[PDB]
Ligand binder design. Structure first.
Ligand code: CL
Ligand code: NA
Ligand code: NA
Length: 190
């Protein structure tokens, strides 16, 4: 289906360079103001060389800007358009302490994995899990995808999303308020 169908998403990543990718079922959506065809539905198998649906994605903030895609117990690492050699790997081999079948991830060098009501911090070692709702104020303990900007993170749940200020770690006050339509207020779909 197309970007503006209103259906929930499976994953997002901000490449931290002006471009980002959304994932839903078998489809990958490149979202960049520089794109000749922004939001053109392409097959994940065609762009990333793997079968959808994926569970989570993130892109590291460092120089190399590697993209990580998660599905089940496995992850794939990409750079410069291409799957790195020695991928896929088991999550346990790259991310000790992080569970399988995650719901979401984001990168600020701190990475956060989300699964049910809990999240895990990873630094390039893992800690005890904490509660999403305790540390991300106004975010319920159920997220489908996440992505990190410069001053905000976004949490996606069904057909709606939340924006959280990174300083306050609280959902921002806007009008109409969060949670609100991904299609209408985040993608700027008709
Ligand atoms: Cl995600
Ligand atoms: Na997800
Ligand atoms: Na993400």
């Amino acid at each position: 289906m197309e970007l503006c169908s209103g259906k929930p998403f499976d994953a997002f990543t901000d490449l931290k360079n002006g471009s980002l990718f959304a994932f839903r079922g078998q489809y990958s959506y490149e979202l960049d103001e520089k794109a000749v065809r922004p939001g053109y539905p392409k097959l994940i198998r065609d762009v990333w060389g793997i079968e959808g649906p994926i569970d989570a994605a993130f892109t590291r903030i460092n120089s190399q800007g590697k993209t990580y895609l998660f599905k089940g117990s496995q992850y794939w690492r990409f750079e410069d358009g291409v799957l790195d050699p020695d991928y896929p790997r088991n999550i346990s081999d790259g991310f000790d302490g992080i569970p399988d079948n995650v719901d979401a991830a984001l990168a600020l060098e701190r990475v956060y994995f989300f699964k049910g009501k809990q999240y895990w911090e990873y630094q390039f070692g893992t800690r005890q899990p904490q509660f999403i709702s305790r540390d991300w104020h106004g975010v319920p303990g159920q997220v489908d995808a996440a992505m990190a900007g410069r001053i905000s993170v976004f949490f996606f749940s069904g057909d709606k999303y939340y924006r959280v200020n990174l300083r306050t770690r609280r959902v921002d006050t806007v009008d109409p308020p969060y949670p609100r339509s991904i299609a209408q207020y985040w993608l700027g779909c008709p």
